[PDB]
Amino acid sequence: ETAAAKFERQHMDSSTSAASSSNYCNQMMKSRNLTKDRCKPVNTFVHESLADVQAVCSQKNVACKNGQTNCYQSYSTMSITDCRETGSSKYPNCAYKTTQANKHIIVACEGNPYVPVHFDASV
Secondary structure (H helix, E strand, C coil): CCHHHHHHHHHECCCCCCCCCCCHHHHHHHHCCCCCCCCCCEEEEECCCHHHHHHHHHCEEECCCCCCCCEEECCCCEEEEEEEECCCCECCECCEEEEEEEECEEEEEECCCCEEEEEEEEC
């Protein structure tokens, strides 16, 4: 698996009229193989098109949380879903709270072609 492919598996779920149910994160964290080794504490899925998310690599250059300079913030807000592990959640039955939002995303980009490889933040 390439880094670009990993970003698509971990963070992309393109859909118009995204309506993530209370069960969404429970299903998606499992189906995208994010609960195989351990319960991943937090994750974000983006519902805009791949073209639109890839386009962010040419948008607003911002500092990455880790101090690197290869992060970019979207000029427009994007439909997203946040997944946050619950208190009662016990591996291998990882449990999540599902919260829909409309926010600017920040991603790190690398390579040729210059594409997203890391989801940094939503703002």
